[PDB]
């Protein structure tokens, strides 16, 4: 539910002395931490974050002792992220002129995360390290550090200015130490858990997606009146909308409670009489006349059904259920009931039978008592890991539109010639978005659109952030990376340059 | 590569107009024929109205089908199917796989 | 609405055999 993240940083003088082109680690670290804080604040997952720095002039830690545990400062404690952290990161954090042992930073962070985690149920505890590993240090307490890390089940993560994991001996020794630490904490899998600054910048440039949790829907799949299988349904695919809506506030005082919206009803007479909300009724239109139909009368005459019904109306061949007829705004994934072996066996048997016979189930679905019944299709979906039914709504008789369109093949004036067909074939061949893997096993997708985050939320978050930090400046333009991710690889365009020219030459398109 | 279970919205129908741009019908027919021959669908970015975020959609060609009485039941054109985004998908609880005897 | 009578009549004893094969004599659905 919640996680505690103690971000360790190095604020020594070593990074400041670097080639300007390399974009010295100070600015990269500030950028990555700023993006991380932005993602955390704009995605409210209730995660606590604290900031610790080692290599600064000042000293402020719970433990002082002797010369050790010095030049280390805990700037922020475990608390919910807020814009004040971003403001402090932007300017309040400045480089120092001292050096410190990152081992001391690690012990300080362990002390902080152990002392301030009391009274809160945190299932995760990640400690991130940001340093150049170019500061002289001595190794004399790694045994106890590893023991504490293992006992407390604290995950460790590292970032360095280099990808490997052209460096000095001190950097090599630091790399050896970090690699040994990761091998001890996790092992072979932990070697790759060291991420360069640029690689992190690559993956943290996009705001976190809106992750809603679907509540399980228990019901019973019934075939007749004697067979019943306990099932649980979840919402797999649906259109996602913003969780927070815009609130209208008075322009001057900027307060919600200063505005009140209300509606009134007045007659159509010349005098414009006033009619109260208790002096009106609901009605409908029947041709050229109007028939009153009160709400109580409608409820009395309303169609009444028994809610929570998942009944198999029948079984039909998959070829008779076309994809173009799918309706609704949801897709349901139906699994067996949790902790139920008999239900799982029955559902697996039904799914396997349907798959073998190439059949689907036409069924009736109703969410609850006050939900309109629906007729839908459930079809099997078998994977190496799990198998489940997939339910999608189907149209009624009233939902079908009978439109007649002129034929194109038989049209005499709309018949393309051989050259046009050849050019279109060339265009299609050049603009292929799927590539065969050396004609060996299968295809591979060049432009998968399912993994692209929705640009609407990204733009909204960007503009909200820009207004929050810069109340006076106007909104910025759309970021370039959004456009890049919303467009295909440049190779497709490069290949299609010439076929498109041929299409333009052959086809005489004119606007009227 | 188009998943039948990746349903997000009802599909639409795209048909040449031949009233705003002349010659569009020939190109549309050629595209339909070639797509049917090569079994491909045209991926596109769709923006219905002004001030609306774009959506990634796919155009699947449709082949004219007539009944015994020569009555249209499937008009020729393109079927516009909406493709879900990354956030449009929801994670599922992990369930152990229980098999069934033949 | 499913035709429960017709489905019951068509499935003479298949449901009973399926229940015996799958459901042990202790399982209670809808409970």
């Amino acid at each position: 539910n919640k996680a505690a993240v103690v971000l360790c940083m190095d604020v020594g003088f070593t990074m400041s002395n670097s080639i300007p082109g390399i974009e010295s680690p100070f600015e990269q670290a500030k950028k990555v931490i700023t993006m991380f804080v932005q993602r955390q604040v704009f995605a409210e997952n209730k995660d606590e974050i604290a900031l610790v720095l080692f290599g600064t002039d000042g000293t402020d830690n719970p433990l002082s002792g002797g010369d050790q545990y010095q030049n280390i400062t805990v700037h922020r404690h475990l608390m919910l992220p807020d814009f004040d952290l971003l403001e402090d990161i932007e300017s309040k954090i400045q480089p120092g002129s001292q050096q410190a042992d990152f081992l001391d930073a690690l012990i300080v962070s362990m002390d902080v995360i152990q002392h301030e985690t009391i009274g809160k149920k945190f299932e995760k505890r990640h400690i991130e390290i940001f340093t150049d590993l170019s500061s002289r240090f001595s190794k004399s307490q790694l045994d106890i550090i590893i023991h504490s890390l293992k006992k407390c089940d604290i995950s460790l993560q590292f970032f360095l200015p280099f990808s490997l994991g052209g460096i000095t001996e001190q950097q090599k020794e630091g790399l050896e130490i970090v690699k040994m630490v990761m091998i001890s904490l996790e092992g072979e899998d932990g070697l790759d858990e060291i991420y360069s600054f640029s690689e992190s910048l690559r993956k943290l440039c996009v705001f976190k997606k809106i992750e809603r949790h679907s509540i399980h829907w228990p019901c019973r799949l019934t075939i007749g009146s004697n067979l019943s299988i306990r099932i649980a349904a979840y919402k797999s695919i649906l259109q996602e909308r913003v969780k927070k809506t815009w609130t209208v506030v008075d322009a001057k005082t900027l307060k919600k409670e200063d505005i009140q919206k209300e509606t009134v009803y007045c007659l159509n007479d010349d005098d414009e009489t006033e009619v109260l909300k208790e002096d009106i009724i609901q009605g409908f239109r029947y041709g050229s006349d109007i028939v009153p139909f009160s709400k109580v009368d409608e409820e009395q005459m309303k169609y009444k059904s028994e809610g929570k019904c998942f009944s198999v109306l029948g079984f039909c061949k998959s070829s008779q259920v076309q994809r173009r007829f799918f309706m609704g705004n949801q897709v349901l994934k139906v699994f067996a009931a949790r902790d139920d072996e008999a239900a799982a066996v029955a559902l697996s048997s039904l799914i396997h039978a349907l798959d073998d016979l190439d059949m689907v189930a036409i069924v009736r679905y109703a969410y609850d008592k006050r939900a309109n019944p629906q007729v839908g299709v459930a079809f099997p979906h078998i994977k190496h890991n799990y198998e489940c039914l997939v339910y999608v709504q189907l149209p009624f008789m009233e939902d079908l539109r009978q439109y007649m369109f002129s034929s194109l093949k038989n049209s005499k004036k709309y018949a393309p010639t051989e050259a046009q067909l050849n050019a279109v074939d060339a265009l299609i061949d050049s603009m292929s978005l799927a590539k065969k893997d050396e004609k060996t096993d299968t295809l591979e997708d060049l432009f998968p659109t399912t993994k692209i985050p929705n640009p609407r939320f990204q733009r909204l978050f960007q503009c909200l952030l820009h207004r929050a930090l810069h109340p006076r400046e106007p909104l910025p333009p759309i970021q370039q990376h959004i456009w890049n991710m919303l467009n295909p690889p440049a190779e497709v365009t490069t290949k299609s340059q010439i076929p498109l020219s041929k299409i333009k030459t052959l086809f005489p398109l004119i606007e009227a | 590569l188009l998943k039948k279970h990746h349903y997000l919205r009802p599909s639409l129908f795209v048909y040449p107009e031949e009233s705003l741009v002349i010659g569009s019908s020939t190109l549309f027919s050629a595209l339909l024929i070639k797509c049917l021959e090569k079994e491909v669908a045209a991926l596109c970015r769709y923006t219905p109205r002004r001030n609306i975020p774009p959506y990634f959609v796919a155009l699947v060609p449709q082949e004219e089908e007539l009944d015994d009485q020569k009555i249209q039941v499937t008009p020729p054109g393109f079927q516009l199917v909406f493709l879900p985004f990354a956030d449009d998908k929801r994670k599922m609880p992990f369930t152990e796989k229980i098999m069934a005897t033949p | 609405l499913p035709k429960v009578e017709a489905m019951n009549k068509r499935l003479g004893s298949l449901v009973d055999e399926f229940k015996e094969l799958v459901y042990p004599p202790d399982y209670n659905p809808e409970g």
Binding site: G314, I362, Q402 | I71 | -
Partner: peptide, 24 residues
């Protein structure tokens, strides 16, 4: 044209709904 409805010209006549009818 064959199958044209006699109430609303220009629209195909819809066959009455038969629900589910099990085959032999």
């Amino acid at each position: 044209c064959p199958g044209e409805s006699l109430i609303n010209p220009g629209f195909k006549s819809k066959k009455p709904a038969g629900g589910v009818d099990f085959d032999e």
